[PDB]
Design a protein around this ligand. Sequence first.
Ligand SMILES: Nc1ncnc2c1ncn2[C@@H]1O[C@H](COP(=O)(O)OP(=O)(O)O)[C@@H](O)[C@H]1O
Ligand SMILES: [Mg+2]
Length: 278
Amino acid sequence: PTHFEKRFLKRIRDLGEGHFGKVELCRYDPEGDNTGEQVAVKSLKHIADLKKEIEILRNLYHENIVKYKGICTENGIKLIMEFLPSGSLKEYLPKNKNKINLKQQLKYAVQICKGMDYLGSRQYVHRDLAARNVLVESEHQVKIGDFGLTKAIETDKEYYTVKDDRDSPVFWYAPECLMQSKFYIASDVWSFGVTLHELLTYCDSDSSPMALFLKMIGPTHGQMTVTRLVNTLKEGKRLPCPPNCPDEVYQLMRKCWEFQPSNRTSFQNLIEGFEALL
Ligand SMILES: Nc1ncnc2c1ncn2[C@@H]1O[C@H](COP(=O)(O)OP(=O)(O)O)[C@@H](O)[C@H]1O
Ligand SMILES: [Mg+2]
């Protein structure tokens, strides 16, 4: 069930491609009759990073967390998971602007929040909660997908300190992350507020968190981007209320963006908040 033979993973097409690896659509077909199930295969070309990601995903089992299927061994390793045909929200929302209404957006918000609350109960900080990492199973079901930057918060500890040279989604990050490299469950609540904004703007590229924040901070050298961003956030500046987003949804977004981590709302309070609106 969990061990996939490389010779039976028949590549169909690419789903995602980055500088250091890719995600492909395959059919695991050991019978050769073309009746095998379609899977999403994550690979490289960082090695220890994918194994950590495999380790975490392997230990998570939830309705709103992408289903781990298994691995494919070479030293190299491949992550096998369920294929969600509609892909990420970053892909889905621009193609379905006319099809998706507020009720539906709220239904995804609750779903994201349930997967995140499950994740926090497992003592994990996602560290990459963005629309591009929220996968669409159906018109009414989404699942959290990429555990590449995910870290376990030690028992009785409030946060994890990120000590490394890896790239980070700074435009989705809470001030403590940018300033001290501290990652609390409340840091994930911050990223959720940024994700909710993307979800309400239908992932319009011109209104993306990076594009709006870069427009706020003006001309900057890359080395000064995070400091310029820290300062914008210290002044009280936030992503504006998306047009046609009701105040009741914006106040819940604002509850995700309280400067101090302890002043932010919980994922459970967010679930209850969106449910009252449905
Ligand atoms: N299980 C899946 N089913 C379908 N598409 C997927 C799946 N996992 C990832 N993808 C697609 O591949 C892209 C990259 O995958 P992700 O694992 O989030 O990557 P990374 O760490 O490279 O950015 C996603 O944005 C989505 O478009
Ligand atoms: Mg991703």
